[PDB]
Chains A and B, each alone.
With several copies, the nearest count.
Chain A
Amino acid sequence: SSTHIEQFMPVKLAQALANSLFPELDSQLRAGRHIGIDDLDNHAFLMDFQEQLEEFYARYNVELIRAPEGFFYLRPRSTTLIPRSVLSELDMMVGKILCYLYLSPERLANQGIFTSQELYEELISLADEGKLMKFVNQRSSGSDLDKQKLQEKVRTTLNRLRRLGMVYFLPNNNNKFTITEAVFRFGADVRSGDDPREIQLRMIRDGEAMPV
Protein backbone atom coordinates (compact mmCIF):
# COMPACT_ATOMS: atom_id res chain seq x y z
CA SER A 1 0.00 0.00 0.00
CA SER A 2 0.96 3.66 -0.15
CA THR A 3 2.70 5.36 2.78
CA HIS A 4 4.61 2.09 3.18
CA ILE A 5 8.37 1.83 3.56
CA GLU A 6 8.79 -1.16 1.25
CA GLN A 7 7.61 1.08 -1.60
CA PHE A 8 10.94 2.93 -1.57
CA MET A 9 13.46 1.20 0.72
CA PRO A 10 13.86 -2.26 2.31
CA VAL A 11 12.85 -2.35 5.96
CA LYS A 12 16.23 -3.46 7.31
CA LEU A 13 18.17 -0.85 5.34
CA ALA A 14 15.86 1.88 6.65
CA GLN A 15 16.26 0.57 10.19
CA ALA A 16 20.04 0.61 9.79
CA LEU A 17 20.03 4.15 8.40
CA ALA A 18 17.80 5.32 11.27
CA ASN A 19 20.07 3.87 13.96
CA SER A 20 21.89 6.33 16.21
CA LEU A 21 25.28 4.94 15.11
CA PHE A 22 24.75 5.44 11.37
CA PRO A 23 25.87 9.10 11.05
CA GLU A 24 29.23 8.84 12.82
CA LEU A 25 30.04 5.62 10.97
CA ASP A 26 29.06 7.08 7.60
CA SER A 27 31.07 10.27 8.10
CA GLN A 28 34.12 8.29 9.21
CA LEU A 29 33.79 5.84 6.32
CA ARG A 30 33.44 8.56 3.70
CA ALA A 31 36.46 10.24 5.30
CA GLY A 32 38.44 7.07 4.52
CA ARG A 33 38.47 5.48 7.98
CA HIS A 34 38.90 1.71 8.22
CA ILE A 35 36.85 -0.25 10.75
CA GLY A 36 38.44 -2.98 12.84
CA ILE A 37 37.35 -5.38 15.55
CA ASP A 38 38.29 -2.87 18.27
CA ASP A 39 35.34 -0.55 17.54
CA LEU A 40 33.00 -3.24 18.83
CA ASP A 41 29.80 -1.22 18.43
CA ASN A 42 30.57 0.05 14.93
CA HIS A 43 31.95 -3.31 13.78
CA ALA A 44 28.84 -5.13 15.01
CA PHE A 45 26.64 -2.52 13.35
CA LEU A 46 28.40 -3.07 10.04
CA MET A 47 28.17 -6.85 10.42
CA ASP A 48 24.43 -6.92 11.16
CA PHE A 49 23.38 -4.69 8.24
CA GLN A 50 26.42 -5.31 6.04
CA GLU A 51 24.48 -6.14 2.86
CA GLN A 52 22.15 -3.18 3.09
CA LEU A 53 25.12 -0.83 3.38
CA GLU A 54 26.97 -2.32 0.39
CA GLU A 55 23.89 -1.88 -1.77
CA PHE A 56 23.23 1.62 -0.40
CA TYR A 57 26.83 2.75 -1.00
CA ALA A 58 26.75 1.17 -4.46
CA ARG A 59 24.56 4.14 -5.36
CA TYR A 60 27.69 6.27 -4.94
CA ASN A 61 29.75 4.00 -7.23
CA VAL A 62 31.84 2.87 -4.25
CA GLU A 63 32.16 -0.67 -2.89
CA LEU A 64 31.81 -1.33 0.82
CA ILE A 65 34.37 -4.12 1.05
CA ARG A 66 35.16 -6.50 3.91
CA ALA A 67 38.66 -7.93 3.66
CA PRO A 68 39.13 -11.53 4.84
CA GLU A 69 40.80 -10.18 7.98
CA GLY A 70 37.38 -8.81 8.95
CA PHE A 71 37.82 -5.04 8.55
CA PHE A 72 35.36 -3.06 6.43
CA TYR A 73 36.18 -0.03 4.31
CA LEU A 74 35.21 1.80 1.11
CA ARG A 75 36.88 1.42 -2.28
CA PRO A 76 35.76 4.06 -4.81
CA ARG A 77 35.39 3.10 -8.45
CA SER A 78 36.62 5.01 -11.47
CA THR A 79 33.08 6.44 -11.65
CA THR A 80 32.97 7.20 -7.92
CA LEU A 81 30.50 9.78 -6.68
CA ILE A 82 32.80 10.22 -3.65
CA PRO A 83 36.32 11.49 -4.50
CA ARG A 84 39.30 9.12 -4.18
CA SER A 85 42.92 9.43 -3.07
CA VAL A 86 46.06 7.29 -2.78
CA LEU A 87 48.52 6.99 0.10
CA SER A 88 52.07 8.28 -0.28
CA GLU A 89 55.00 5.90 -0.75
CA LEU A 90 56.25 6.82 2.73
CA ASP A 91 52.77 5.90 3.94
CA MET A 92 53.31 2.48 2.35
CA MET A 93 56.63 2.14 4.14
CA VAL A 94 55.09 2.92 7.50
CA GLY A 95 52.08 0.68 6.85
CA LYS A 96 54.21 -2.28 5.81
CA ILE A 97 56.36 -1.72 8.89
CA LEU A 98 53.24 -1.51 11.04
CA CYS A 99 52.04 -4.84 9.64
CA TYR A 100 55.45 -6.29 10.46
CA LEU A 101 55.16 -5.06 14.05
CA TYR A 102 51.68 -6.57 14.27
CA LEU A 103 53.14 -9.89 13.12
CA SER A 104 56.56 -9.47 14.78
CA PRO A 105 56.99 -11.52 17.98
CA GLU A 106 60.26 -9.85 19.06
CA ARG A 107 58.27 -6.83 20.27
CA LEU A 108 55.71 -9.03 22.05
CA ALA A 109 56.81 -7.52 25.38
CA ASN A 110 55.40 -4.20 24.18
CA GLN A 111 51.98 -5.92 24.23
CA GLY A 112 50.86 -3.93 21.20
CA ILE A 113 51.74 -0.50 22.63
CA PHE A 114 54.41 1.12 20.47
CA THR A 115 56.20 4.47 20.39
CA SER A 116 57.09 6.39 17.24
CA GLN A 117 60.79 6.05 18.09
CA GLU A 118 60.60 2.25 17.98
CA LEU A 119 58.70 2.43 14.69
CA TYR A 120 61.40 4.63 13.18
CA GLU A 121 64.17 2.36 14.46
CA GLU A 122 62.50 -0.68 12.90
CA LEU A 123 61.88 1.25 9.67
CA ILE A 124 65.54 2.18 9.33
CA SER A 125 66.53 -1.37 10.24
CA LEU A 126 64.54 -2.93 7.39
CA ALA A 127 64.66 -0.14 4.79
CA ASP A 128 67.56 1.62 3.08
CA GLU A 129 68.45 4.50 5.37
CA GLY A 130 69.98 6.99 2.96
CA LYS A 131 68.13 5.86 -0.15
CA LEU A 132 64.84 6.08 1.75
CA MET A 133 65.98 9.48 3.02
CA LYS A 134 66.40 10.55 -0.60
CA PHE A 135 62.63 11.05 -0.83
CA VAL A 136 62.52 13.21 2.32
CA ASN A 137 64.97 15.60 0.68
CA GLN A 138 66.66 15.28 -2.70
CA ARG A 139 69.96 16.65 -1.33
CA SER A 140 70.29 14.47 1.77
CA SER A 141 73.54 12.63 2.47
CA GLY A 142 73.07 11.65 6.12
CA SER A 143 72.79 15.15 7.60
CA ASP A 144 71.26 15.02 11.07
CA LEU A 145 68.97 17.95 10.23
CA ASP A 146 67.52 15.87 7.42
CA LYS A 147 67.44 12.94 9.86
CA GLN A 148 65.13 14.91 12.14
CA LYS A 149 63.14 15.90 9.06
CA LEU A 150 62.59 12.23 8.23
CA GLN A 151 61.59 11.52 11.82
CA GLU A 152 59.04 14.33 11.66
CA LYS A 153 57.73 13.07 8.32
CA VAL A 154 57.30 9.58 9.78
CA ARG A 155 55.43 11.08 12.72
CA THR A 156 53.13 13.00 10.37
CA THR A 157 52.41 9.90 8.28
CA LEU A 158 51.68 8.00 11.49
CA ASN A 159 49.16 10.67 12.47
CA ARG A 160 47.45 10.46 9.09
CA LEU A 161 47.21 6.68 9.40
CA ARG A 162 45.72 7.18 12.85
CA ARG A 163 43.10 9.25 11.05
CA LEU A 164 42.54 6.25 8.76
CA GLY A 165 41.99 3.84 11.67
CA MET A 166 45.12 1.77 11.04
CA VAL A 167 46.43 2.88 14.45
CA TYR A 168 44.90 4.16 17.70
CA PHE A 169 46.53 6.61 20.08
CA LEU A 170 46.09 5.68 23.70
CA PRO A 171 43.21 7.26 25.66
CA ASN A 172 45.65 9.69 27.28
CA ASN A 173 48.85 9.43 25.22
CA ASN A 174 49.40 10.68 21.69
CA ASN A 175 53.04 9.48 21.78
CA LYS A 176 52.06 5.80 22.11
CA PHE A 177 49.68 3.73 20.01
CA THR A 178 48.08 0.34 19.42
CA ILE A 179 47.97 -1.29 15.99
CA THR A 180 44.77 -2.54 14.33
CA GLU A 181 44.15 -5.39 11.91
CA ALA A 182 43.39 -2.91 9.11
CA VAL A 183 47.16 -2.62 8.55
CA PHE A 184 46.89 -6.03 6.87
CA ARG A 185 45.78 -4.24 3.70
CA PHE A 186 49.37 -3.03 3.26
CA GLY A 187 50.26 -6.66 2.56
CA ALA A 188 47.55 -7.34 -0.01
CA ASP A 189 50.27 -7.46 -2.68
CA VAL A 190 51.95 -10.42 -0.93
CA ARG A 191 49.06 -12.28 0.71
CA SER A 192 48.86 -14.47 -2.43
CA GLY A 193 51.78 -16.73 -3.27
CA ASP A 194 52.25 -15.77 -6.92
CA ASP A 195 54.52 -13.59 -9.05
CA PRO A 196 54.57 -10.00 -7.71
CA ARG A 197 54.15 -8.46 -11.18
CA GLU A 198 50.90 -10.33 -11.86
CA ILE A 199 49.39 -9.60 -8.43
CA GLN A 200 50.15 -5.90 -8.86
CA LEU A 201 48.22 -5.88 -12.15
CA ARG A 202 45.35 -7.81 -10.56
CA MET A 203 45.13 -5.31 -7.70
CA ILE A 204 45.35 -2.22 -9.91
CA ARG A 205 42.66 -3.74 -12.13
CA ASP A 206 40.47 -4.28 -9.06
CA GLY A 207 41.13 -0.67 -8.06
CA GLU A 208 42.90 -1.78 -4.88
CA ALA A 209 46.15 0.02 -5.72
CA MET A 210 47.12 2.61 -8.31
CA PRO A 211 50.78 3.09 -9.32
CA VAL A 212 53.03 6.12 -8.82
Chain B
Amino acid sequence: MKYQQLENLECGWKWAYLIRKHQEGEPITKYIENSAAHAAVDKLIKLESEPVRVLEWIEQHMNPDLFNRMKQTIRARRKRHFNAEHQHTRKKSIDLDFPVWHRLSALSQRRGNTLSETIVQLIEDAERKEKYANQ
Protein backbone atom coordinates (compact mmCIF):
# COMPACT_ATOMS: atom_id res chain seq x y z
CA MET B 1 0.00 0.00 0.00
CA LYS B 2 1.71 3.27 -0.99
CA TYR B 3 -1.17 5.76 -0.60
CA GLN B 4 -2.99 6.11 2.71
CA GLN B 5 -6.63 5.06 2.40
CA LEU B 6 -9.03 7.55 4.02
CA GLU B 7 -12.49 6.13 4.64
CA ASN B 8 -14.51 9.35 4.91
CA LEU B 9 -12.98 10.60 1.63
CA GLU B 10 -13.16 7.46 -0.48
CA CYS B 11 -16.75 6.97 0.70
CA GLY B 12 -17.69 10.44 -0.52
CA TRP B 13 -15.91 9.77 -3.80
CA LYS B 14 -17.89 6.56 -4.19
CA TRP B 15 -21.19 8.28 -3.43
CA ALA B 16 -20.46 11.02 -5.96
CA TYR B 17 -19.51 8.39 -8.54
CA LEU B 18 -22.76 6.50 -8.03
CA ILE B 19 -24.87 9.66 -8.26
CA ARG B 20 -23.06 10.85 -11.38
CA LYS B 21 -23.51 7.46 -13.01
CA HIS B 22 -27.22 7.40 -12.20
CA GLN B 23 -27.90 10.92 -13.46
CA GLU B 24 -26.07 9.90 -16.64
CA GLY B 25 -28.82 7.28 -17.03
CA GLU B 26 -26.85 4.10 -16.36
CA PRO B 27 -28.36 1.26 -14.26
CA ILE B 28 -26.23 1.39 -11.12
CA THR B 29 -28.79 -0.81 -9.36
CA LYS B 30 -28.80 -4.58 -9.77
CA TYR B 31 -32.62 -4.56 -9.90
CA ILE B 32 -34.54 -5.03 -13.12
CA GLU B 33 -37.84 -4.02 -11.51
CA ASN B 34 -38.47 -0.29 -11.78
CA SER B 35 -39.91 0.17 -8.29
CA ALA B 36 -37.10 -1.50 -6.34
CA ALA B 37 -34.47 0.28 -8.43
CA HIS B 38 -36.14 3.64 -7.81
CA ALA B 39 -36.37 2.94 -4.08
CA ALA B 40 -32.70 1.94 -3.90
CA VAL B 41 -31.67 5.08 -5.79
CA ASP B 42 -33.81 7.21 -3.48
CA LYS B 43 -32.15 5.63 -0.44
CA LEU B 44 -28.75 6.31 -1.97
CA ILE B 45 -29.79 9.94 -2.45
CA LYS B 46 -30.78 10.13 1.22
CA LEU B 47 -27.31 8.75 1.99
CA GLU B 48 -25.64 11.99 0.75
CA SER B 49 -24.53 13.20 4.18
CA GLU B 50 -23.71 9.69 5.47
CA PRO B 51 -20.88 8.36 3.29
CA VAL B 52 -20.29 5.51 5.75
CA ARG B 53 -23.59 3.83 4.84
CA VAL B 54 -22.68 4.14 1.16
CA LEU B 55 -20.51 1.03 1.39
CA GLU B 56 -23.51 -0.90 2.68
CA TRP B 57 -25.77 0.53 -0.03
CA ILE B 58 -23.17 -0.72 -2.51
CA GLU B 59 -23.16 -4.19 -1.00
CA GLN B 60 -26.98 -4.31 -1.13
CA HIS B 61 -27.97 -2.76 -4.48
CA MET B 62 -24.89 -1.94 -6.58
CA ASN B 63 -24.93 -3.46 -10.08
CA PRO B 64 -22.48 -6.40 -10.31
CA ASP B 65 -21.05 -4.91 -13.51
CA LEU B 66 -19.54 -1.87 -11.81
CA PHE B 67 -17.05 -3.41 -9.35
CA ASN B 68 -14.12 -3.20 -11.77
CA ARG B 69 -14.86 0.33 -13.00
CA MET B 70 -15.52 1.45 -9.43
CA LYS B 71 -12.24 0.03 -8.08
CA GLN B 72 -10.42 1.56 -11.04
CA THR B 73 -11.90 5.05 -10.83
CA ILE B 74 -11.49 5.51 -7.08
CA ARG B 75 -7.93 4.16 -7.25
CA ALA B 76 -7.03 6.63 -10.00
CA ARG B 77 -8.74 9.47 -8.14
CA ARG B 78 -6.73 8.64 -5.01
CA LYS B 79 -3.47 8.62 -6.97
CA ARG B 80 -4.26 11.96 -8.61
CA HIS B 81 -5.37 13.57 -5.35
CA PHE B 82 -2.17 12.58 -3.58
CA ASN B 83 0.04 13.57 -6.53
CA ALA B 84 -1.62 16.99 -6.91
CA GLU B 85 0.07 18.22 -3.72
CA HIS B 86 3.38 19.00 -5.46
CA GLN B 87 3.98 20.21 -9.00
CA HIS B 88 6.85 17.79 -9.62
CA THR B 89 4.48 14.84 -9.09
CA ARG B 90 1.63 16.26 -11.18
CA LYS B 91 0.77 15.19 -14.72
CA LYS B 92 0.25 17.39 -17.77
CA SER B 93 -2.20 16.49 -20.52
CA ILE B 94 -1.27 17.30 -24.12
CA ASP B 95 -2.79 16.45 -27.48
CA LEU B 96 -0.81 15.11 -30.45
CA ASP B 97 -1.62 14.80 -34.15
CA PHE B 98 -2.03 11.25 -35.42
CA PRO B 99 1.18 11.10 -37.52
CA VAL B 100 3.29 12.54 -34.72
CA TRP B 101 1.75 10.28 -32.09
CA HIS B 102 2.10 7.27 -34.38
CA ARG B 103 5.81 7.87 -34.85
CA LEU B 104 6.34 8.56 -31.15
CA SER B 105 4.46 5.45 -30.03
CA ALA B 106 6.32 3.30 -32.54
CA LEU B 107 9.63 4.67 -31.26
CA SER B 108 8.63 4.11 -27.63
CA GLN B 109 7.46 0.56 -28.27
CA ARG B 110 10.79 0.02 -30.04
CA ARG B 111 12.78 1.25 -27.04
CA GLY B 112 10.46 -0.48 -24.57
CA ASN B 113 9.89 2.61 -22.43
CA THR B 114 7.00 4.90 -21.57
CA LEU B 115 6.20 8.00 -23.59
CA SER B 116 7.66 10.30 -20.94
CA GLU B 117 10.88 8.26 -20.90
CA THR B 118 11.15 8.40 -24.69
CA ILE B 119 10.62 12.17 -24.62
CA VAL B 120 13.25 12.41 -21.89
CA GLN B 121 15.76 10.51 -24.02
CA LEU B 122 14.94 12.61 -27.09
CA ILE B 123 15.09 15.98 -25.34
CA GLU B 124 18.29 14.82 -23.63
CA ASP B 125 19.94 14.06 -26.97
CA ALA B 126 18.88 17.49 -28.24
CA GLU B 127 20.19 19.11 -25.05
CA ARG B 128 23.44 17.15 -25.38
CA LYS B 129 23.89 18.63 -28.85
CA GLU B 130 23.12 22.06 -27.39
CA LYS B 131 25.57 21.48 -24.52
CA TYR B 132 28.44 20.41 -26.78
CA ALA B 133 27.67 23.43 -28.96
CA ASN B 134 27.92 25.58 -25.83
CA GLN B 135 30.72 23.94 -23.82
A residues whose Cβ falls under 8 Å from a Cβ of B: 1-2, 4, 6-10, 18
Residue in A2, A10, A18 whose beta carbon sits within 8 Å of that of B34 in the complex: A10
CB of B7, distance to nearest CB on chain A (Å): 27
Chain B interface main SS type? helix
B45 & A1 in contact (Cβ 8 Å cutoff)? yes
Q: For residue A7, which residues in chain B have a CB less than 8 angstroms away from its CB? A: 35, 38-39, 42
- Chain A binding site: helix, strand, loop or mixed by DSSP? loop
- In the complex, the answer to whether B35 meets A9 with C-beta atoms within 8 Å is yes
Establish whether residues B38 and A4, one from each chain, have CB atoms under 8 Å apart when the complex forms: yes
Docked CA distance A39–B6 (Å): 48
Q: What 1/0 flags go to B12-53 for Cβ under 8 Å of A?
A: 000000000000000000000011001100100110000000
Q: Residues of B contacting A2 with CB < 8 Å?
A: 42, 46
Interchain nearest-CB distance for B19 vs A (Å): 13
Smallest CB gap from A3: residue in B: B42
Name 19 interchain pairs, CB-CB below 8 A, sorted by A: A1-B42, A1-B45, A2-B42, A2-B46, A4-B38, A4-B42, A6-B34, A6-B35, A6-B38, A7-B35, A7-B38, A7-B39, A7-B42, A8-B35, A8-B39, A9-B35, A10-B34, A10-B35, A18-B35
Q: For A6, list chain B residues within 8 Å (CB).
A: 34-35, 38
